[PDB]
Symmetry: C2
Subunit: 288 residues, 2 copies
């Protein structure tokens, strides 16, 4: 209804009062609500480098150009922090981008993925094949359904890593029970990766979320910063949490340089891993 | 127009970013460029915003990142910076950070646009307060003319806060900058984004090395108002074997360290770690 070839997409979001970013639309590939949210896929200006762009609820999620940053940082920062990650769970991750990166690791014997929106997955399968290729991997069991119901019915010490690639669709509505479930389904040496907000637009939420996950029972939580151009302020982050008291996730436990796919990565390496946990002074208290 | 500022596409068309305007304080050309000052949405955190040639340069909210990174990354990499030159830096932001250092005996500043510094004096006092400091000699004029008429081995640090505006002249200019630096001299130059012009950073980097600098390293930073959200700075060392990626004089030892909002020795070291697609700049 809104987008039109030759017109411009506009990301507004009320998180930021009085700010907006826009991209010129070449061709609309999809624009409509789903069962759970508003999906919008389109081809951007060929003169520009962003390529095919996807927006969920009026917020750009994936673009061909910078897509690798968020997927590598979540996938590898958490897995490289675990001594031997054999079994992995991803809550969300419908486009398959984080799954693609987890599946690079030879140690991963199986990975479960649970996202609620099946139509987003289908549109990723069509317009982002390079991202969604891994949904069909023999080591991946992809499920469409409720992540809360899944983790509650999962027995204890099942997973080595749990990646939460979602902000819910400030532990509000379902955090208390869910993060307790996440803690118990992790093995004693378990690592939990959670997508964080920007240190520019919602530092207050990062502080609350960090304190909440520590109160839940995690022995440590550390915020990793990253350069993502398409995000409103240009820097989202992620909370990498340990169940085991003692482990320091800010230095890679298994450095990616010692495995054969290190040179295929566009963003992440061991030096970026270390660098991501150095926060500006104004935001430094998050990591103590 | 209708209560929204829109940032220029220019290089790489199709992208644009916009801010809601509450009150326009200034909007008109000057002698050398289009200056645009306005108050942003009070509900938003940006405060007073300044744009040069349709490109946001300074906002009250994130202004400290760019100024601390240029000022301190270069000074903290020098063993004892007594004399400093800033080409550009009309708003006084980089000057304010350089002047925090006790070792700095004097600092010369040469920017070509006098109207920009007058508008900074008015609408950005917290930034431009340093222009009146007794250790600062502020000059309005050509930076190319100034550096060619400056004798050898005059400066410890030279901070180039500009991508060339004054009406092309790199070859002569960077030779001058190399010559006017003392043997242990550091040169800080503002870089472009690794996202939208990596090709330019690579060229700029090789050019400065070919000019005579023993090493050149690109420091990355988080600046939300920049198109992609990450500009950087090239830190260039005349003396060979200098690893500027580890601070020579840690800011933690200086008393103003806790007054900084962004920069510290941890951020210093992290800044030189580049994504793999851009790591060939520093290798």
């Amino acid at each position: 209804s809104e987008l039109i070839s030759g017109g411009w997409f506009r990301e507004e979001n009320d998180q930021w009062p009085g700010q907006a970013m826009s991209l010129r639309v070449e061709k609309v590939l999809y624009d409509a609500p789903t069962k759970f949210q508003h999906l919008t896929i389109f081809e951007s200006d060929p003169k520009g480098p962003w390529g095919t762009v996807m927006a969920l609820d009026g917020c750009i999620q994936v673009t061909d150009y910078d897509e690798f940053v968020y997927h590598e940082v979540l996938g590898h920062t958490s897995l490289c922090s675990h001594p031997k990650p054999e079994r992995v769970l991803i809550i969300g991750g419908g486009d398959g981008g984080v799954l693609r990166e987890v599946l690079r690791h030879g140690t991963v014997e199986h990975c479960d993925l649970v996202d609620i929106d099946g139509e987003v997955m289908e549109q990723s399968k069509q317009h982002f094949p390079q991202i969604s290729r891994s949904l069909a991997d023999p080591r991946a069991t992809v499920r469409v359904g409720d992540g809360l119901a899944f983790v509650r019915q999962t027995p204890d010490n099942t997973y080595d890593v749990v990646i939460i690639d979602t902000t819910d669709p400030a532990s509000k509505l379902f955090g208390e029970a869910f993060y307790k479930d996440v803690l118990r389904i992790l093995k004693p040496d378990g690592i939990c990766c959670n997508q964080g907000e920007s240190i520019w637009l919602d530092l207050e939420l990062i502080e609350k979320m960090s304190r909440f996950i520590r109160e839940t029972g995690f022995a440590s939580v550390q915020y990793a910063l990253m350069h993502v151009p398409t995000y409103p302020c240009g820097s989202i982050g992620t909370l990498v949490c340990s169940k085991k008291a003692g482990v320091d996730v800010t230095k890679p436990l298994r450095p990616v340089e010692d495995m054969p796919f290190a040179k295929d990565l566009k963003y992440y390496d061991s030096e970026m891993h270390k660098a991501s946990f150095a926060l500006p002074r104004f935001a430094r208290h998050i990591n103590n």
